[PDB]
Design a binder for this molecule. Structure first.
Ligand SMILES: O=C(O)CCO/N=C/c1ccc(O)cc1
Ligand SMILES: O=C(O)CCO/N=C/c1ccc(O)cc1
Lengths: 116, 116, 116, 116
């Protein structure tokens, strides 16, 4: 089952953050960021199916959550351009990665839930 | 389906917070706190089945999460006695309440996800 | 020289949370919450001068931050009644405590900074 | 008089996060990240003196907080490589920015306090 999931919540409305664009990148050997996967959060604030076990190999990944566009669509002026979560994915440890983000106009928190 | 759910995460280990005691109270007419429901978080960090739609009427509720005992069992010295979430439950609005808590030894955050 | 300080920030506006009422209680020998100190946050979101080292003895304290009133004055209907921070203080000799809170309408986080 | 300040707290120890490396970048006209300023947090968890009002012109800035190195020195293997805070600055005239970060091994939150 999916090894990388993203969950986004809205701390102003107390709801999933719906239709949030999410872009994932993998760090290339020349230290640049290579597009890897993308999607939009669902009505439950979740984004599944970004990648597969076969392709999600060890390496450094960046998950960019397009928070600015989200707040603009709600008519709220935000601080950040996006929320960026940068981490190393590794094999000897819990398999499923869930990247959770809690959004406010001038603040955000992000948490990783790593389980098998 | 269940109108009050609790989800607890551990920000040190990146995992659900398992076997965390949770006590819910309702505010009585004499302004005291009346025991209402309790349980222990599951292996997924979740506590379901605390109450039913029929009994969960409008009023002020307190959800106490016994964080101190959780950290002590992990051998970590914590700051808080517990995390307390106090809110009014109301009928004209999203039906399902999810009280989420993210735990660290000297900090915690709590968020409400209200949906129907 | 202030042993107990409270700092509150607004995650919607990216500013200190001004004029937030704060009530402090201490658990008495008969297990009730006795009023200990109160005040309001300043223009900087800070509340100083609640107590003195002499009066701030060992005990279990509860810091109640009146978030609901804060949001109502901004025209926002928030989820929580207040943020409650409960902790044992000075059980290993005197310490200085800063209780920080970050507020959003449906979420808040609280951290403690403890120094000798 | 400092227009850009960084404050970092440790949610495990309940203390300022000391000696945390911070790198600031500004997006150049060719869309690359140009080095802008860097430093390390003090005993109070604060980093001041990164720039001057004159040099801190309008632009998109990225504040990279080197959290992984911080946790490794404490013997903790954390999830994130660093915390990245990306924002447009001074697009409506000069402002003063405080970028605050609260760190846990598998979680972090960042807030901005912006004043005129
Ligand atoms: O049960 C749910 O819907 C929430 C599951 O994911 N949320 C995680 C989370 C919640 C609150 C935080 O301050 C940080 C992370
Ligand atoms: O006591 C101290 O050292 C200063 C307290 O300032 N707290 C700032 C803060 C606290 C929690 C956050 O999630 C973001 C910023």
């Amino acid at each position: 089952k999916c090894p990388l999931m993203v969950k986004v919540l809205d701390a102003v409305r107390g709801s999933p953050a719906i239709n949030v664009a999410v872009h994932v990148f993998r760090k290339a050997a020349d230290d640049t960021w290579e597009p890897f996967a993308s999607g939009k959060t669902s009505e439950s604030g979740e984004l599944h199916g970004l990648t597969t076990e076969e392709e999600f190999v060890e390496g450094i990944y960046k998950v960019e959550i397009d928070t600015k566009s989200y707040w603009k669509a709600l008519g709220i002026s935000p601080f950040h351009e996006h929320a960026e979560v940068v981490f190393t994915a590794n094999d000897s440890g819990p398999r499923r990665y869930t990247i959770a983000a809690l959004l406010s106009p001038y603040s955000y928190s992000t948490t990783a839930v790593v389980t098998n």
